[PDB]
Design a protein around this nucleic acid. Structure first.
Lengths: 87, 97, 77, 95, 110, 98, 84, 95, 110
DNA sequence: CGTTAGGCATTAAGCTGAACGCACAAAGGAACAAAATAAACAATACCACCGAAACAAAGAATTAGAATAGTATAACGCTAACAAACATAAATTAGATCGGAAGAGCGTCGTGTAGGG
DNA sequence: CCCTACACGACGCTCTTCCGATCTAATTTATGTTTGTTAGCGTTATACTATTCTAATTCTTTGTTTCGGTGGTATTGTTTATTTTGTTCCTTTGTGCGTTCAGCTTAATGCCTAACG
């Protein structure tokens, strides 16, 4: 089949070589086989907390689109400010 | 007949990825995942490309800080690999929960 | 799968044949570069040179409308 | 003349014997509650300020502070707050 | 001349917080130029509920230790025991409130 | 020969007593002396109230108890019970200051 | 007022730090924790007191009051209560 | 008509060929530098705002922003900044 | 009528930042009612030095990698290698800047 | 000595034409990715043993509350005065819109390197 | 000791992108009031420190004792280096719908006077 098993693992689209890339940026040598789903839990909690803020921003401003500067404001909410987009 | 000892190419992967600076996640899985998550709040929520790209950038920066933290935690723990105990330790001492 | 595809535009009408020509004439050449060069060529092409493809695209659009009248188009995930 | 230093302490006492008509409170917790009220007011008004600055609007309305308490308050507290807030401005606009 | 009877806006909302005080406090608070009419109403509502709720759990903790005076220790257990609002008050520590009682599960003896 | 308890029962008893307590731990006069002796290195001849040094005592208390709770959470991870300077260095590295 | 205060870093005592760790849920203490705790406390108090000094030097005072220490702890993200 | 979206980019270019008359810069780092300038300006102006609110003064002066950069900037950078800032307002007040 | 020659305040300070822009930017920036005359002068001075300094180390990093275009990678090594200003930029991460090279001293092989 | 009732500049609330964003069609490989095998080494189970730290009496500065002397210092009330706010151009200038040029990607050679017998 | 699969300089093509020139709304900056915050000076009262008295208290000191830390030896199992197939994902212009924006009209609205707890 095109998709293995029952699929529906959009978060499992961030595959184990990709998490291996993110880990090898982070200066780790060996990775245990029980890192990936917990890293995915970090993905869930971080993206929920940012996307909730950004959708609150764009829902107050009567707009159906999410602007990158609203994402920068939502990351300025949590001390998580990035650069390169304006501010 | 050229099977390497495990770790030398790991050092080479460390050097190539720390020397490199581009995005590390394929953009379409992250796009579909963000499209999945954001529909749970409201419907018909499109994004700019800079929005999604920014989200991938912030997520990757948060993850690389987290994994540097857990690797320092693991090496305080006299081990040379990471375990989810190190993950929840770094999520405790930095104060997220 | 049941999804109804878009009609080919004029670029598509010209790009399909020319991409087939480039693959036949110049093999072992990566497809992305071929698409970039076809884009460049189409941008260099004079407007007068493009009338058959334009008209062809329009005819395909008419046939599409006749064959698929409910195509208001509503893309869904 | 002399510096008059104000607080919310009588309203703390009033809401105290509103919810619990029996218990007392030290001067310690009264000052704690006063810093509580002014810190939450500062954070809410500053958030509403930057939201008005982003949406190019020169005022603060009920919508702006509603977005602000939707932003700051985590979870069910925000839902409780927005329900009673709409209740309160319907009370205020009814008269 | 003769004005009407002075009805306050706190009486206009069934409210126990001063509307005019927070109205001028936003006005001199330098947050925007104009201020909406119901926005101090909304502000006073959410502040009354926030502290009213704090009071409800604090007094239950204080009566739970059989004392009728509110102690900052009771405040500390109220804001640290309940996790719903602890996330608002993560970086804020109560003076003279101590640390909520806790113990590591492994440090019990065998 | 007097009876001595096994080491840890006295420790656990004073854990429950001192985490049960509410009073200030650090003695007020040496704390006052340390605050004045480190304050004189920026602008000398500085006086404080009771209230400022009391709030400073509370801030120091909160920061130290958070640092030691996080240090104990570090030291439990190493299958250890005591604390070490490497534990405090790990704690101040994960906090983001050192 | 005719004195320059020096050598009070060990004014805090070893059993006081032990009692601090007893509040902190810590069981056993090695003999090296005390100097490091003194250093950590000294640099933390150095930072907050330096903030309060420049606070007071702005507002044309000669003494330090409590609310400036509240503003220092508010600017450092360590906001305390019970002092206005 | 159309929204005009401004930045500081020409002044970034000007200080660039001030310090280094040889090197170029991508559009990436130009936007980075623009967010850098507006974020530091936001933090400095907000700190000066709350300092004016505490000292019961309705204005912002050079003293207020001097206290603000004394507060935010850690170390020798603050000392360098206050020295050149006093230099700059002596230049401005000389004319 | 005939005004004098338009001398800007940036020319009045030997300055490369727009004084009038930050003057109105404080004026509409809603921080206080009145604004002092030399406070935008002070502001423009410290912003010019902050970025001027960033430029000095960034260009040394970029020439140090033998390229004459400024790359956000060079920005990342400039703001992470020097510790004097890293404490200002702890919670701020550069987009497309990567992570500064750093390897654990124990993970070298024997 | 603090809070509330009337009168208009000024600001958003709809409202419609118009510019802008984004998905998505064909065509291909190709970078990527999932799975399977030694292996090896690193986490781990556990033992010796040891010295470094808990328990606890005996004294030892020392805080701990209280006056109190005095005393530099927040914390006032009028000024006035200097500095900013509010009109009013003009003129620079910052930014939008087209042009070239060189700076860096692609790669490819050979070179040096530093890892499995 | 051995040789030998992957990172770097010289150089040429290549394309792209960023530096240079030019026109034009706009907004920045000299005048000239009004007005209104705040240095500055007299005052004052006030809260903070120095000093000294009981006292109590808790820190140190000198031991016992005991148990966790650490080094060491099996051990095993679990991840890696590597191949071997799956597999999804790069690029381009034109078309269509959805959304946002900006000018425009118009209705709310709160800045600024005058009286009750």
């Amino acid at each position: 089949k095109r998709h293995r098993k029952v699929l529906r693992d959009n978060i499992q689209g961030i595959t184990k070589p990709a998490i291996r890339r993110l880990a090898r940026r982070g200066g780790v040598k060996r990775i245990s086989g029980l890192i990936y789903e917990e890293t995915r839990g970090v993905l869930k909690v971080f993206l929920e907390n940012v996307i909730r803020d950004a959708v609150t921003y764009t829902e107050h401003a009567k707009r159906k689109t999410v602007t990158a500067m609203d994402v920068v404001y939502a990351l300025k909410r949590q001390g998580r400010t990035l650069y390169g987009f304006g501010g | 007949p050229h099977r390497y000892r495990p770790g030398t190419v790991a050092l080479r992967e460390i050097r190539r990825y720390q020397k490199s600076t581009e995005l590390l996640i394929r953009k379409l899985p992250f796009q579909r995942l963000v499209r999945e998550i954001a529909q749970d709040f409201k419907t018909d929520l499109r994004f700019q490309s800079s929005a999604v790209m920014a989200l991938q950038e912030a997520s990757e920066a948060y993850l690389v800080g987290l994994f540097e933290d857990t690797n320092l935690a693991a090496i305080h723990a006299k081990r040379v690999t990471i375990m989810p105990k190190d993950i929840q330790l770094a999520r405790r001492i930095r104060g997220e929960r | 799968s049941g999804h109804i595809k878009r009609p080919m535009n004029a670029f598509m009408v010209w790009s399909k044949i020319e991409r087939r020509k480039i693959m036949e004439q110049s093999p072992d050449m990566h497809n992305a570069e071929i698409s970039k060069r076809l884009g460049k060529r189409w941008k260099m092409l004079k407007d007068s040179e493009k009338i058959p493809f334009i008209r062809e695209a329009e005819r395909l659009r008419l046939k599409h409308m006749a064959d698929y009248p409910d195509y208001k188009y509503r893309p869904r995930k | 003349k002399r510096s008059r230093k104000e607080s919310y302490s009588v309203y703390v006492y009033k809401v105290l014997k509103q919810v619990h008509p029996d218990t007392g409170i030290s001067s310690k917790a009264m000052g704690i509650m006063n810093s509580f009220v002014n810190d939450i007011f500062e954070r809410i008004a500053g958030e509403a300020s930057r939201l008005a600055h982003y949406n190019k609007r020169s005022t603060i309305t009920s919508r702006e502070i509603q977005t602000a308490v939707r932003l700051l308050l985590p979870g069910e507290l925000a839902k409780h707050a927005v329900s009673e807030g709409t209740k309160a401005v319907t009370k205020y606009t009814s008269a | 001349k003769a004005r009407a009877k002075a009805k306050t806006r706190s009486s206009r909302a069934g409210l126990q917080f001063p509307v005019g005080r927070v109205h001028r406090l936003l006005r001199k608070g330098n947050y925007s130029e104009r201020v909406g009419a119901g926005a101090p109403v909304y502000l006073a509502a959410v502040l009354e509920y926030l502290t009213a709720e704090i009071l409800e759990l604090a007094g239950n903790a204080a009566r739970d230790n059989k004392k009728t005076r509110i102690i900052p220790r009771h405040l500390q257990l109220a804001i640290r025991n309940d996790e719903e609002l602890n996330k608002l008050l993560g970086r804020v520590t109560i003076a003279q409130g101590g640390v909520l009682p806790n113990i590591q599960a492994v440090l019990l003896p065998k």
